[PDB]
Write a protein that binds this ligand. Structure first.
Ligand SMILES: *C[C@@](*)(O)[C@H](CCCNC(=N)N)NC(=O)CNC(=O)[C@H](CCC(=O)O)NS(=O)(=O)c1cccc2c(N(C)C)cccc12
Ligand SMILES: [Ca+2]
Lengths: 55, 254
């Protein structure tokens, strides 16, 4: 299911036996309780532009 | 960068500038506080490995504003499959002697997982390429970091859409084309090692490395980039290894 639309994951997706999918996040992020969204756990997470984020 | 625009200061925070004896060599991409991804062919002619410097937070080459951070390159790792003088497997992983300090102007680009990059990122049409390389084919380099948005093509569609020349390097699975064939926009000499960054749901990822092309923005041709997804595992494995004596290190690939 990861193959189809990133399995709904905001970042990384891992397939499991059956219709079980697990979303994961890059270092410096935590997976939200919705199981798909990633939120920064540090001041400067990768791939984010500060001057724009703060705007 | 040809036919692009100035990257507003701070909007290309992962962009790296590589210097050799103080002179402009190439660009690179920061992926964490001590690792930089660049292009292997940037080191073909280097003889004095101790004079290789990496500059983060750089924007305007004519002025020091305090956001710049310089680090000596402690190690340059290149895949064993890379052959000097050619363009296949054009990637290099660099270890800084000391970590850079993340700030508003110094931020790493996310190195994506292979699966994510192949079945998701690879399909995002447009991506940003940047550098202080030549503004024109056989032209002068830029004083301010330039950025350009370019569309990615299927190698197949790249092949039968480009003016077939001769002895022109083959487009392999370790590459991909991006840009325009109307001779208006493209990356250029000096931009090599620079990032081809792709956006996906609010975050940017490294999908390419400025690698090569026939001239710059040559009508009927596209810029060619190193397909990073093919090196994710190779990179992750090296970042987990202890440093070794000697700057240049050829590592087995796969
Ligand atoms: C490391 C870099 O800075 C640089 C980036 C160039 C990106 N170009 C574009 N986005 N269009 N990489 C290189 O310099 C790698 N080599 C080339 O791009 C090379 C140009 C040589 C030069 O003029 O200095 N082109 S190529 O690899 O397509 C190439 C290779 C071999 C022969 C070529 C010929 N021969 C037949 C004269 C013609 C055209 C290109 C050739
Ligand atoms: Ca400066």
């Amino acid at each position: 299911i990861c193959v189809n639309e990133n399995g709904g994951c905001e970042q990384y997706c891992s397939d499991h036996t059956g219709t079980k999918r697990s979303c994961r996040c890059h270092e410096g992020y935590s997976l939200l309780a919705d199981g798909v969204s990633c939120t920064p756990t540090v001041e400067y997470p990768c791939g984010k532009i500060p001057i724009l984020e703060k705007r | 960068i040809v036919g692009g625009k100035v990257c507003p200061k701070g909007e290309c925070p992962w962009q790296v500038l590589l210097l050799v004896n103080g002179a402009q060599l190439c660009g690179g991409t920061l992926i964490n506080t001590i690792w930089v991804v660049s292009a292997a062919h940037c080191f073909d002619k280097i003889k004095n490995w101790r004079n290789l410097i990496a500059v983060l937070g750089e924007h305007d080459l004519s002025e020091h504003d305090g956001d710049e951070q310089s680090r000596r390159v402690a190690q340059v790792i290149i895949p064993s499959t890379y052959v000097p003088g050619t363009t296949n497997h054009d990637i290099a992983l660099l270890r800084l002697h000391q970590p850079v300090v993340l700030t508003d102007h110094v931020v790493p680009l996310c190195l994506p997982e292979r699966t994510f990059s192949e079945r998701t990122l690879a399909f995002v049409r447009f991506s940003l390429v940047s550098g202080w390389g030549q503004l024109l084919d056989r032209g002068a380099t830029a004083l301010e970091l330039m950025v350009l948005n370019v569309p990615r093509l299927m190698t197949q569609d790249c092949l039968q859409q480009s003016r077939k020349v001769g002895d022109s390097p083959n487009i392999t699975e370790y590459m991909f084309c991006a840009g325009y064939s109307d001779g208006s926009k493209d990356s250029c000499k000096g931009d090599s090692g620079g990032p081809h960054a792709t956006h996906y749901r609010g975050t940017w990822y490294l999908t390419g490395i400025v690698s090569w092309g026939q001239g710059c923005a040559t009508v009927g041709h596209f810029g060619v980039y190193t397909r990073v997804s093919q090196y994710i595992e190779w990179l992750q494995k090296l970042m987990r290894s202890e440093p070794r004596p000697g700057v240049l290190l050829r590592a087995p690939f796969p």
